[PDB]
């Protein structure tokens, strides 16, 4: 099935986020806030053991991460989704590309922008006036998040947790 | 902070659920089906540590249950909830039990029936006419489940998972 690795922050984040997803994330019923760590992957059901097996070593090789958000941003036009920017640091890149190896195994590695998606599936009018808004919108929000989850999807699309993993 | 500790059992089962409670359950955008925690509960968010080290003890002497849904049924005349039900066991028990132990003392039950709700909030006309559908609909389902989420409740009621605990 498919699986997906993120960071839920502090519920204060994610209350903050959802005054928002309530109208404009279609993902608001199907899973909570979250910072995705690794593009969602499909894995078969007895090769998931060792998979929770090698989070475990990239959990224990890392320490809890320092989430700064300072500003709400767009991927547009690439994509209408806007979001609560986190800005990057070294720690965030080298547990992402991490989540690229072993058994979760490569292809990738890269220009990863860590962020708190708070609007998607907008369309181009409904973009800027959400953007509009939202950009008269400060933010000045910093925590420590001291563990990740890996997940998997049901079918009607909702994300339900599997594991939790604690950082150093 | 709200918290609850509760199973969420295969995604075979939680969709069979949800097939159910997207229509009925208005906790169907809040959280994924699941087999209730042990009552929620009120705890001072930072004596989080006790409660998480309480649970990992309770989860090391306990064993993966084993999970055989019977059939629909319904709590009605006490509450207009209609669920899929578990069958009873010494393990579900006992370990219901040990979750009113501890820093998680205070008073207990009124039976504790294992169940996944699919319905509830239910005017007494709709139940009416959803347990006449369902109390005969068939449903045999068998599964092991080996872990227990706890979570906290956001501003808008969704739950989200704060740790996982393996049994055993």
Redesign the interface.
């Known amino acids: 099935?498919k699986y997906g690795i993120v960071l839920?922050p502090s519920?204060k984040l994610?209350?903050l986020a959802?005054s928002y997803r309530?109208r404009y994330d279609p993902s608001?019923?199907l899973i909570?806030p979250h910072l995705t760590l690794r593009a969602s992957f499909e894995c078969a059901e007895e090769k998931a053991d060792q998979l929770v097996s090698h989070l475990r070593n990239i959990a224990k090789e890392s320490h809890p991460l320092v989430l700064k958000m300072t500003k709400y941003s767009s991927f547009a036009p690439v994509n209408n989704v806007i979001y609560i920017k986190a800005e990057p640091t070294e720690e965030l890149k080298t547990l992402n590309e991490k989540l690229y190896t072993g058994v979760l195994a490569g292809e990738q590695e890269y220009n990863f922008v860590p962020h708190v998606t708070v609007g998607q599936n907008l369309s181009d009018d409904e973009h800027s006036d959400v953007l509009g808004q939202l950009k008269m919108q400060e933010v000045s929000h910093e925590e420590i998040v001291d563990?990740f989850?890996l997940l998997?999807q049901?079918?009607?699309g909702?994300?339900?947790?599997?594991?939790?993993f604690l950082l150093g």
């Not at 909702?158 to 939790?164: L, N």
């Open positions: 099935m839920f519920k994610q209350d959802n309530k608001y019923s909570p563990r989850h998997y049901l079918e009607n909702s994300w339900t947790v599997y594991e939790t």
